[PDB]
Structures are given as C-alpha cells and as structure tokens.
Structure 1
Amino acid sequence: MKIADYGQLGEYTCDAKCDAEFGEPGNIRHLEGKTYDYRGVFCFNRKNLQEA
C-alpha cells in the first residue's frame, strides 16, 4: 500500500453561513512487484575428474 496524499477538508468561513463546504479527499493506491530467476549449468568428464 502507498498513501499518495491526504487532501484538505476544513476552511475558514464566515459566522453567518450556517452551512459548511466539502473538501477534497485523500488518495490511496495499491502497488506490486515481482521476483527474478538466476540459472546456469556446467559439465564435466568422469575420467578426467577422477584422475586429476
């Protein structure tokens, strides 16, 4: 999870205004990743490997 933003809600307003305003909400996001593969190979000869 990544919390991209928080946004702003409140504001300074007059006392006469009995209502209130709507702000801008935050913004949350989802992310993901992967893994990778490392591979190799090597070969021998039995007689040489035994005699060396």
Structure 2
Amino acid sequence: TYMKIADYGQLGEYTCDAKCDAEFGEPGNIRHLEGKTYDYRGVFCFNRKNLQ
C-alpha cells in the first residue's frame, strides 16, 4: 500500500482590498493505493527409464 499525491490545489491569492470571495480555496487529494503480486506454477514429469 502506498500514497499518490493527486494535486495540491489553490490558495486564495493577491487580494488588495477586502472583497471576501476566495477565502479557503481548494486543496488536493492523497489517493491511497494498493497492489498485489502473481506467480508461475509450472511442472513436468519423466517416468524412470527414458530419463535414465
């Protein structure tokens, strides 16, 4: 399990005099992730003499 910062987001910018519109802005996500693993699992067989 790992994390993936999707985005950072904006924070209210460059207001000279109070108009009170962009107070909090919007932040991004952290997006926890996962992932598994796999396997091969093969076999074979000879009898006793065709190998000897």
- TM-score over 0.5 for the pair: yes
Aligned-pair identity in percent equals 100
Partner Cα separation in structure 2 for residue 22 and residue 11 of structure 1? 10
Q: Which has the higher strand share?
A: 1
Partner of 2:40: 38
Task: Give, in angstroms, the shift of residue 47 of structure 1.
Answer: 1.9
Partner Cα separation in structure 2 for residue 13 and residue 21 of structure 1? 10
**Could you say if the C-alpha distance between residues 46 and 7 of structure 1 is closer, same or farther in structure 2, counting changes exceeding 3 Å?**
same
Q: Alpha-carbon deviations, 1:1-52, whole Å to 9, x = none?
A: 10000001131213356997111112111111110110111111212211xx
Runs of 4+ in 1 over 4 A off after TM superposition: 16-20
Q: Which has the higher helix share?
A: 1
Using the size of structure 1 for normalisation, the TM-score is 0.72
Question: Unaligned stretches of 5+ in structure 2?
Answer: none
Matched length:
50
Using the size of structure 2 for normalisation, the TM-score is 0.72
**Structural RMSD (CA):** 2.4
